[PDB]
Amino acid sequence: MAGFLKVVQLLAKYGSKAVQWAWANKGKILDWLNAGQAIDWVVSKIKQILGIK
């Protein structure tokens, strides 16, 4: 869970709703990281889902 919590910690700068989405989608995030997706790629993907631009 080291990559997952790095994702959540990087999202915390963006606020509670970003952290909220990450916890509810923990399995997606774990699956992306295990599929070879980088932590920074996952943070960007989540920001795109949230509409942070």
Numbering used by the authors: 1 to 53
Q: What do the authors say?
A:
Tryptophan is frequently found on the surface of membrane-associated proteins that interact with the lipid membrane. Here, we describe the use of racemic protein crystallography to probe dedicated tryptophan interactions of a model tryptophan-rich bacteriocin aureocin A53 (AucA) by inclusion and/or exclusion of potential ligands. When proteins of natural L-chirality are introduced with their synthetic D-enantiomers, they can form centrosymmetric crystals in achiral space groups with high dimensionality, thereby enabling structures solved at a high resolution over wide-ranging conditions. Finally, in complementation to recent studies, this work illustrates racemic protein crystallography is an effective approach to elucidate tryptophan interactions of membrane-associating proteins.
However, LnqQ lacks the corresponding W3 residue and, as anticipated, was found to be monomeric: sharing essentially the same retention time as that of AucA-W3L in the SEC analysis. Furthermore, W41, which is equivalent to W40 in AucA, is anticipated to be most crucial for activity, and its replacement by a leucine residue nearly demolished all LnqQ’s antibacterial activity likely due to a lack of H-bond donation. For other tryptophan residues including W21, W23 and W32, their replacement resulted in a greater loss in LnqQ’s antibacterial activity, when compared to those of AucA. A plausible explanation is that the LnqQ is more sensitive to residue substitutions because of its monomeric nature, and so for future work the biophysical properties of LnqQ will be investigated. The involving residues, particularly W40 and Lys44, are highly conserved, with presence in lacticin Q25, lacticin Z40 and epidermicin NI0141.
